[PDB]
């Protein structure tokens, strides 16, 4: 219910605002300002392609005019803790009587310089803080009656969350009791609950997923677990606990049409999709330790292509893999929901 | 060089003391007392099989008689710090000892304990995540050394033992060999390394990478201690180990005759060739990374007599076609050769 200002300097049209743009694309909260000095006065729709109006202002001070109650950090430096230029914006929000939402790995709630400026009633939320009372997972989710669908990917930042959400909205539209489960800071900021898995200690990672899945599993027909990471990314781990903790019934593989190498580490290739499907299936079944878990279809991210090319790419992916496929954001999720439902 | 007392309440013959029992089995430090209420006055050899003589006493206070200088927490509850641990810790600190803490809950910045700490003593939180980690980038692939990672069909089966024996066999042969600890026990035994299970998921591969890069240009072969198992439903650690170290060879560890997971009996252990395919597939990423073979099988035959162990080894060879032996029982040379000829 609180009016939001999103700190988004250099991230509206740049590369560091993934969180902020995701919030602008999906949050039902009343977002009253986008803070980006590079885009002040510009049209959010024209420069991002998101169908929403929010004034873009030069700074937190310029945002005050819109009376925001919470400043949400929507940018993150390429592996760089807290940049020196952030503090001024953070402190300005605090002195104005605002609360702070922080999705970064570095916690801000116990920094004296910020606590001193935090006015009564206001709070600083470190979204990545590990949930309490985690234990080791035991595969208990396999016992649940609901379907458990995990989005997996050929790389990170390709639409895994978008796919889980679109699949959730399609199941809801068709009359199923559906629930979306957040597994990253953005997802948790959107839903207001879940777990930022990449900040959980290795020992408790699977348990963090299991715990959330056991909390809602008996109350829904289908759970849509937000994917994270990739087994093709050399620095990623989070896919394993997602699979182990959730004991998925079906997998949906997300992939950006035409991508042949990891984005962060361009030397690492993306194998052909049939090989990627085999990899995930083998991991999900544990070579026989767990039940067979199929990749039921492919969610192809074609946003960079014209409609004609997008359709060809979809057609090519089906021919290559022999599985159902579409761009769920672009053309709808029913093709993949059906694939999930008739498994 | 410091005299060690191991806090091992309920862990000498129960299930929570894997760490202390491994220190008793492998530590070159002079261990002067095992602390366990359940086994005070009993024979360590008779109740555990381990050969070194160490008196088992009722408490830290009863251990003082043996002049211990360091209290090592060799137990972990299934939970943070149980209420019955506090007296034991304070008693050791007041008596001028250091504390070596392998629990997930850090003890070095607790006012009450820190106040009891004397000059020249410390409280070491072994599970503290290392500073300034980055997300891994496959940098280990550029190192000229061999990077051998032990993997397994379950946890607590001898992955660390296998890594150690291969390391010790390599050192004997004159090669520049280095053992890399990846858990609390191995870090205590080596004094350095990383407690992987306490690292945040995002930086886990990077914690392994960082360590491998430190020692990779100065040795011919690194022995990365294995953790977890891809067959265990709660285990995550094996992936970051594979990703961060970019291993050249894998050595699969398996307890002879084990058909199902220990902690979760409903979960079966598939035929070894299927386990091998799983590990090899994960290691290659289906083509994203180089082909990494499981070159041999380290079989834990401890629970069997020699005849049944030799035969179990032979069955594994017949079933997998790979070199195999029990390294802790018949020498590591079989598997070291399998590593070196790949």
């Amino acid at each position: 219910n609180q009016r939001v200002a999103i700190l988004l300097h250099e991230g509206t049209t740049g590369t560091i605002g993934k969180t902020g743009l995701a919030l602008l694309r999906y949050s039902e909260a009343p977002i009253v300002a986008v803070i980006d000095r590079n885009c002040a006065g510009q049209s959010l729709r024209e420069i991002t392609g998101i169908y929403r109006y929010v004034p873009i202002v030069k700074s937190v001070e310029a945002a005050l005019e819109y009376k925001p109650q919470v400043l949400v950090i929507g940018i993150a430096p390429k592996g760089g803790g807290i940049p020196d230029d952030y503090w001024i914006e953070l402190k300005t929000a605090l002195q104005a009587g605002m609360s702070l939402v922080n999705g970064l790995h570095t916690p801000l709630a116990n920094i004296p310089d910020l606590n001193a400026l935090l006015q009564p009633g206001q709070l600083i939320w470190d979204v990545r803080k590990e949930p309490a009372n985690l234990d080791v997972a035991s595969g208990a989710a396999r016992t649940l009656p609901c379907r458990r669908v995990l989005t997996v990917g050929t790389d990170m930042a390709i639409g895994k969350m978008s796919t889980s959400l679109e699949l959730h909205w399609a199941a809801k539209l068709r009359g199923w009791r559906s629930k979306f489960l957040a597994t990253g800071q953005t997802g948790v900021m959107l839903e207001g609950d879940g777990v930022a898995l990449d900040a959980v200690r290795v020992d408790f990672a699977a348990g963090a997923v299991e715990q959330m899945v056991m909390r809602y599993g008996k109350n829904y027909d289908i759970l849509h677990i937000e994917g994270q990471g990739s087994l093709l990314h050399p620095g990623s781990t989070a896919t394993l606990p997602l699979i182990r903790g959730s004991q998925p019934t079906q997998l949906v593989l997300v992939h950006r049409a035409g991508q042949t190498h990891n984005g962060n580490n361009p030397h690492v290739p993306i194998p052909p999709l049939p090989e990627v499907i085999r990899l995930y299936e083998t991991v999900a079944s544990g070579g026989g330790a767990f039940g067979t878990v199929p990749v039921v279809g492919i969610a192809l991210n074609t946003a960079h292509l014209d409609e004609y090319a997008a359709k060809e790419a979809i057609a090519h992916t089906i021919a290559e893999t022999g599985l159902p496929c579409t761009d769920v954001v672009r053309f709808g999720a029913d093709v993949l929901l059906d694939a999930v439902m008739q498994n």
Side-chain angles (χ1 to χ4, degrees), chain A residues 3-17 19-27 29-44 46-57 59-66 68-77 79-83 85-99 101-122 124-214 216-277 279-343:
Chain A
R3 301 182 206 85
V4 172
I6 305 178
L7 185 68
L8 197 49
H9 294 293
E10 307 187 310
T12 311
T13 59
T15 56
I16 65 176
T19 299
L21 296 166
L23 297 177
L24 290 164
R25 180 176 273 107
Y26 296 119
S27 182
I31 295 165
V32 304
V34 165
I35 298 161
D36 184 6
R37 57 178 175 264
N38 293 8
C39 297
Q42 295 182 29
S43 170
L44 185 62
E46 297 309 316
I47 73 190
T48 62
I50 301 172
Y51 298 104
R52 181 178 202 166
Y53 173 65
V54 179
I56 306 176
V57 296
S59 60
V60 173
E61 185 82 39
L64 299 185
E65 192 176 19
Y66 298 96
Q69 293 162 297
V70 187
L71 180 71
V72 182
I73 299 176
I75 48 175
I82 301 291
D85 60 356
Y86 282 32
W87 300 107
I88 291 168
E89 295 293 55
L90 302 182
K91 291 184 174 188
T92 304
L94 293 181
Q95 288 197 152
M98 302 180 55
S99 283
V101 178
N102 177 35
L104 300 181
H105 274 285
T106 302
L108 296 177
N110 294 111
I111 293 185
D113 309 55
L114 298 185
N115 275 329
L117 309 183
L118 188 63
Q119 297 184 219
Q122 307 304 143
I124 298 176
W125 179 33
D126 294 322
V127 176
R128 270 170 163 149
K129 186 175 177 173
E130 182 175 314
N133 306 137
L134 293 181
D135 209 0
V136 176
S138 67
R142 79 192 188 285
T143 308
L144 297 166
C146 64
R147 279 183 160 81
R148 301 174 301 280
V149 189
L150 175 62
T151 38
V152 296
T154 56
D155 196 2
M156 288 166 49
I158 59 175
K160 293 187 293 305
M161 192 184 75
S162 298
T163 301
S164 293
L165 286 172
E166 294 288 3
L167 287 162
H168 160 66
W169 298 320
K172 186 180 180 183
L173 186 64
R174 289 167 59 183
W176 278 286
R177 291 181 46 85
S178 182
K179 206 199 195 320
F180 167 80
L181 295 176
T183 60
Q185 70 287 351
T186 302
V188 174
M189 279 178 268
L190 281 180
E191 293 296 315
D193 208 335
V195 56
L197 187 62
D198 72 6
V200 177
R201 290 167 285 182
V202 162
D203 221 9
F204 303 115
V209 176
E210 185 180 73
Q211 195 195 60
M212 182 176 53
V213 167
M214 296 296 290
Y216 305 102
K218 299 173 187 176
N219 292 318
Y220 294 87
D221 300 322
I222 184 170
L223 273 53
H224 307 267
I225 304 90
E226 175 183 11
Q228 305 289 347
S230 173
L231 295 177
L232 308 184
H233 190 300
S236 181
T237 291
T239 307
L240 184 53
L242 286 169
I243 290 176
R244 294 280 178 277
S246 66
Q247 298 284 290
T249 53
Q250 297 76 26
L251 299 172
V252 172
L253 178 57
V254 191
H255 171 73
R256 176 179 292 112
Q259 193 181 335
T260 61
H261 297 87
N262 183 250
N264 296 156
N265 309 280
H267 68 274
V268 183
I270 295 186
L273 290 178
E275 287 301 305
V276 179
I277 289 158
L279 169 63
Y280 280 102
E281 286 181 350
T282 293
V283 172
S285 73
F290 313 109
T292 302
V293 184
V295 174
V296 299
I298 293 171
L300 197 64
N301 180 343
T302 67
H304 61 287
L305 299 174
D306 64 39
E307 198 181 20
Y308 187 96
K311 289 177 179 178
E312 282 189 338
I314 289 171
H316 181 89
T317 301
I318 291 168
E320 188 187 17
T321 67
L323 294 173
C325 170
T326 191
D327 184 331
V328 307
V329 170
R330 191 162 197 171
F331 305 111
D334 283 336
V335 165
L336 302 180
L337 178 58
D338 292 343
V340 165
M341 292 304 179
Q342 64 207 130
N343 168 246

